[PDB]
């Protein structure tokens, strides 16, 4: 039993070492070691210490090489013999990482056996060229009202999720993974996404709750979790997003569409800050490293939708930024904002005031996310983003003599706000969203007083299915409204609104 496993392990140690290169450590501590020898070292190689810890050589200096310890100092001792792994930092990539929690080294921390991995691939890689890019057109459906049409997202698309600390930031992303349960339980490989959830700087307990949540929603079988908890060493945390992105590229380079959510890159910044300071390189702007822009940009631009010639794959990217004090002006947030296309800023006041999730639309933008859209949800939702940023203006000066024109807009705006609201961990069909948006745009939610708007919505959906699921089936296949669908929606909406 336990004896057999022990026997397997003893048998599993075989062959005496054959090595012909080493260095011996000089001074060690501060998570940097200075090694004597290793003159044949490759740059940014992975080296293995006799303590068994491994590190990446950063500074190759004429007399010393400065390893960076991916691990804890207690393990290492001065004057130990470091032998070169012989490989640049690579991490196992392959199909069998699917449904496995792993740490950033690729050691399965779910411990569901040794990882089945096709290859290993270097952590840093240059992003696909201009010619390897084909402009986006396939959307990812989020099942969240505003996200899935007012701030729509594509496939391969890089769009920020920014907002206040522990506003359950994570939940927005989880919902996307859940919405794509039937897409990923789909048989169409084009519709299959493979989602990687990178948990950086997070409590190991919290991550375990997330894992359990995902496994409760049986979503684990289509998803990988990479974990880099707070306890894990700060350089290891630094290397954590890069490594995760390599795994994503293996899926991408199968030409298969995917998604990676990097929660939270703000903790990568603090990690890189720690590393930089411990490398005694002068503090950058706002005391965050001077190469922090480079750190993020090299990470971020790996997300792509490969050109049709060179595959078709994608690796969608949504990186989750923990805004300190919720003020988007700040070096780390602005640097990310400039890299990303579109933002999903969330407003705390609204969050508290029961918009779950509270998608601020003043600071949420989406640029090339709206080039991947369901045409039906483009037709119904046209300019509604503008209307509700007229609602924002109107209520700005509402708090005064209100012209009837403004009052009408305010009345619509408020009623629309009720429509926006979603209930966390309940994803909505795209088809189902089309009638709901038609109603509000065409101002039929005047017909339901604001308090009962929520009642109307659920009842309306029940009505729509019972009255004619034919419309929704049509929107399910056609995905583009026709005059018949438009009329059917006018007719159906008026009919339900009346009752």
């Amino acid at each position: 039993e336990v004896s057999s496993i022990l026997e397997e392990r003893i048998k599993g140690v075989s062959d005496e070492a054959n090595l012909n290169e080493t260095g011996r450590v000089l001074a060690v501590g501060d998570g940097i070691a200075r090694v004597f020898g290793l003159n044949n070292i490759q740059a940014e190689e992975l080296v293995e210490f006799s303590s068994g810890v491994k590190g990446m050589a950063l500074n190759l200096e004429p007399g010393q090489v400065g390893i960076v310890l991916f691990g804890s100092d207690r393990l290492v001792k001065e004057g130990e013999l470091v032998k070169r792994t012989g490989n640049i930092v690579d991490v196992p990539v392959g199909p069998g990482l699917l449904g496995r929690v792993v740490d950033a080294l690729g050691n399965p921390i779910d411990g569901k056996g040794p990882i089945d991995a096709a290859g290993r691939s270097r952590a840093q890689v240059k992003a696909p060229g201009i010619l390897p890019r084909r402009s986006v057109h396939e959307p990812v459906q989020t099942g969240l009202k505003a996200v899935d049409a007012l701030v729509p997202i594509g496939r391969g698309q890089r769009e920020l999720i920014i907002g206040d600390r522990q506003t359950g930031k994570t939940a927005v992303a989880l919902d996307t993974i859940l919405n794509q349960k039937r897409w990923n339980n789909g048989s169409d490989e084009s519709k299959k996404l493979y989602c990687v959830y990178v948990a950086v700087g997070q409590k190991r307990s919290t991550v375990a709750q997330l894992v359990q949540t995902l496994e409760q929603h049986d979503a684990m079988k289509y998803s990988i979790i990479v974990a880099a908890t707070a306890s894990e060493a700060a350089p290891l945390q630094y290397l954590a997003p890069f490594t995760a992105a390599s795994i994503g590229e293996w899926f991408r380079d199968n030409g298969k569409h995917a998604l990676i959510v990097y929660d939270d890159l703000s903790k990568q910044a603090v990690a890189y800050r720690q590393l930089s300071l411990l490398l005694r390189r002068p503090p950058g702007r706002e005391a965050y490293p001077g190469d922090v822009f480079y750190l993020h940009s090299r990470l971020l631009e790996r997300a792509a939708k490969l050109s049709e010639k060179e595959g078709s794959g994608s690796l969608t990217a949504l990186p989750v930024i923990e805004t300190q004090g919720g003020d988007v002006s700040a070096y780390i947030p602005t640097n990310v904002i400039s890299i990303t296309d579109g933002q999903i800023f969330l407003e705390a006041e609204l969050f508290y005031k029961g918009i779950r999730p509270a998608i601020n639309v003043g600071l949420s933008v989406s640029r090339v996310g709206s080039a991947a859209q369901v045409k039906a949800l483009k037709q119904v939702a046209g300019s509604l983003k503008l209307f509700l940023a007229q609602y924002r203006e109107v209520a700005a000066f509402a708090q005064s003599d209100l012209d009837a024109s403004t009052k009408q807009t305010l009345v619509r705006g408020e009623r629309l706000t009720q429509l926006l609201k979603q209930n966390q961990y309940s994803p909505l069909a795209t088809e189902e969203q089309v009638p709901l948006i038609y109603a509000g745009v065409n101002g039929h939610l005047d017909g339901i007083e604001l308090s009962r708007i929520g009642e109307f919505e659920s009842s309306f959906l029940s009505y729509l299915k019972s009255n004619h699921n034919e419309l929704l089936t049509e929107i399910r296949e056609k995905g583009e409204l026709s005059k018949e669908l438009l009329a059917s929606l006018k007719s159906a909406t008026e009919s339900f609104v009346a009752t």
């Binding site: 003159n39 070292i41 490759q42 740059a43 940014e44 500074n59 190759l60 004429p62 640049i88 240059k126 992003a127 060229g129 201009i130 010619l131 890019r133 084909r134 402009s135 986006v136 698309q157 390189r281 002068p282 503090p283 950058g284 702007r285 001077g290 822009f293 480079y294 090299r298 631009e301 790996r302 792509a304 002006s329 700040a330 070096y331 602005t334 640097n335 904002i337 400039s338 890299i339 990303t340 296309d341 579109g342 003043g362 933008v365 640029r367 090339v368 709206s370 046209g382 300019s383 983003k385 503008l386 940023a389 007229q390 000066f397 005064s400 003599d401 012209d403 024109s405 403004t406 807009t409």
Partner: protein
């Protein structure tokens, strides 16, 4: 006899070589270390003595073995220029990355070059019409000028630039250079497709545009010399082919950033904030290598990612110095939803003089500025005490100003999709007339929302009819 050397150090991407030969390549010479991944181009930046130079490394480092053979390419990287550059997207090293195959080189010129003389300079003054309402009224551009944006969100900056390309470069017939330093690969692909679509690039046909594109993922050092390459391509058209050109540079904050990144590694104790203690000189050379000489007129457009939107940061500040006109774009006006997001109290142009655009134009603009400044001034008072409880004279001003603010809007054509409103491009002559009327309160009698997100005065009248229904 190629100068051989060894790689003494590899401290970041600032590799140090030790030439074994007593021959020493001079500063700004270029060296090629033959990489098993290709080649690495390095550029000598200091001589530290004991035959140890310290070299900036222009391609992504890794796999370097200390002792690897160096070869002296000599002098700055010499790109190949010609008319054959037109219709190519070229890498920092000048090799076509759009796989148009090697350029049929005419003249190959070193990336670094001295900036044209005081004598060479000639001062233009011709109006260059934009057709953007705010641009035309408040800060009229000039042909050959150096135009500037000081955006904080690149999402807006790219759109602004795209609109400018859409308007100005179709009207313009001469050569044009797009140089995009450290910008998003996806955005770059969009431009490449769009340009090819609008025929400006016609690959089978001919292209009157050339492109240099530098991705923001490219190592910092690479980004540093993307700019210099573009300036060389531009110089070739300006000088050698004599043609009147155009130039777009975005994001030139990245030029600054890259310098700041290398500076520490180079061995320079950083100046304030973090910017390199060589900031003024480096910026100076770059912005004086962009010129309208008496051999050609190069209208240049520079886009600055003001970090944290703090204009007071020295790096944006030193950018402000070398620009003829600027049109600072800010988050507040973006929040107000107005696209274009140009600050109307933070724009200036050298051409705003009445000796240029006429006294009537200047007078109209004067009133707009004064009115808006009043409106900004009473913002405190409006909040503490009701806007109703303001003076009768002031309430007219406030109502006018609310209208003016909304009036300044104008849907863009390129982003007609993104806005979701069919684009509006309006004549400069029409703009002056329209604002004049509005200032005379002629059309002050119709909805404030009728001025919102729409173009010309005639459109406002029509939108009143739409609203009236």
């Amino acid at each position: 006899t190629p100068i051989t050397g060894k790689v003494t150090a590899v401290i970041g991407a600032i590799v140090d070589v030790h030439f074994e030969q007593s021959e020493l390549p001079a500063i700004l010479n270029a060296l090629e270390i033959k990489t098993p991944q290709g080649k690495l181009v390095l550029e000598v930046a200091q001589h530290l003595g004991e035959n140890t130079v310290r070299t900036i490394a222009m391609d992504g480092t890794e796999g370097l073995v200390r002792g690897e053979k160096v070869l002296d390419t000599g002098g700055p990287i010499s790109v190949p220029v010609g008319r054959e550059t037109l219709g190519r997207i070229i890498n920092v090293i000048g090799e076509p990355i759009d796989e148009r195959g090697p350029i049929k080189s005419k003249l190959r010129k070193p990336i670094h070059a001295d900036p044209p003389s005081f004598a060479e300079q000639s001062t233009s003054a011709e109006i260059l019409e934009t057709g953007i309402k705010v641009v035309d009224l408040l800060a009229p551009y000039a042909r050959g000028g150096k135009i500037g944006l000081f955006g904080g969100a690149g999402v807006g900056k790219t759109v602004f630039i795209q609109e400018l390309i859409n308007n100005i470069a179709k009207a313009h017939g001469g050569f044009s250079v797009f140089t995009g330093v450290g910008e998003r690969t996806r955005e770059g692909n969009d431009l490449y497709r769009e340009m090819k679509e609008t025929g400006v690039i016609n690959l089978e046909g001919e292209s009157k545009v050339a492109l240099v594109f530098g991705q923001m993922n490219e190592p910092p050092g690479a980004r540093a010399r993307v700019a210099l390459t573009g300036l060389t391509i531009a110089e070739y058209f300006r000088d050698e082919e004599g043609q009147d050109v155009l130039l777009f540079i975005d994001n030139i904050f990245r030029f600054t950033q890259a310098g700041s990144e290398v500076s520490a590694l180079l061995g320079r104790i950083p100046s304030a904030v973090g910017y390199q203690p060589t900031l003024a000189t480096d910026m100076g050379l770059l912005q004086e290598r962009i010129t309208t000489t008496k051999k050609g007129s190069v209208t240049s457009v520079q886009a600055v990612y003001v970090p944290a939107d703090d204009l007071t940061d020295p790096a944006p500040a030193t950018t402000f110095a070398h620009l003829d006109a600027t049109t600072v774009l800010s988050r507040g006006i973006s929040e107000l939803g107005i696209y274009p997001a140009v600050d109307p109290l933070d724009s200036k142009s050298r051409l705003l003089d009445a000796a240029v655009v006429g006294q009537e134009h200047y007078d109209v603009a004067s009133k707009v500025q004064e009115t808006l400044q009043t409106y900004k001034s009473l913002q405190d008072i409006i909040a503490i005490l009701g806007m109703d409880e303001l003076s009768e004279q002031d309430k007219l001003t406030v109502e006018r100003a609310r209208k003016i603010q909304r009036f300044l809007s104008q849907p863009f054509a390129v982003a007609e999709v993104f806005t979701g409103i069919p684009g509006k491009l309006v004549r400069l002559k029409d703009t002056v007339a329209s604002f004049k009327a509005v200032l005379e309160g002629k059309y002050d009698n119709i909805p404030e929302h009728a001025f919102y997100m729409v173009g010309g005065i005639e459109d406002v009248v029509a939108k009143a009819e739409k609203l009236a229904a």
